[PDB]
Write a protein that binds this ligand. Structure first.
Ligand SMILES: O=C(O)C1=C[C@H](O)[C@@H](OS(=O)(=O)O)[C@H](O[C@H]2[C@H](O)[C@@H](NS(=O)(=O)O)[C@@H](O)O[C@@H]2CO)O1
Lengths: 67, 65
């Protein structure tokens, strides 16, 4: 069983690092999705898909978990 | 694009009340499961199976405007 409401998934990854200071939150997309992914929420409240295997992505996450 | 896309992994079991649905759309073909999304006046996005009869009827209804 699972939510019958839509769930966000990512089908593309932002090619380069987003400005760290423009990011306030992050979350991993559901494991139900075909692609693993990190979604960064910017201070303008935009949601950007990123590759969790990328070094900058992991560092941003580590940083965010400290703030 | 690197923006998120809504996908469906389960279909609502029973027919939603027709009265509170304002529109509908089909989830992206990129999603693994085919699906119709009914958007309620409270903006909930409910997943439904396109093959279901009530689903097709609701769609036809929304198409007749
Ligand atoms: O973040 C949440 O509070 C959250 C609530 C809902 O239970 C789920 O939202 S969803 O139906 O839109 O996906 C989701 O819960 C879980 C996911 O189910 C997990 N994915 S799974 O494939 O292992 O099931 C994963 O993404 O973690 C979240 C939060 O614990 O999100």
């Amino acid at each position: 069983p699972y939510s019958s409401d839509t769930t966000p998934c990512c089908f593309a990854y932002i090619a380069r690092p987003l400005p760290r200071a423009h990011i306030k939150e992050y979350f991993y997309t559901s494991g139900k999705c075909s692609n693993p992914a990190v979604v960064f929420v910017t201070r303008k409240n935009r949601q950007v898909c990123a590759n969790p295997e990328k070094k900058w992505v992991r560092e941003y996450i580590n940083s965010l978990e400290m703030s």
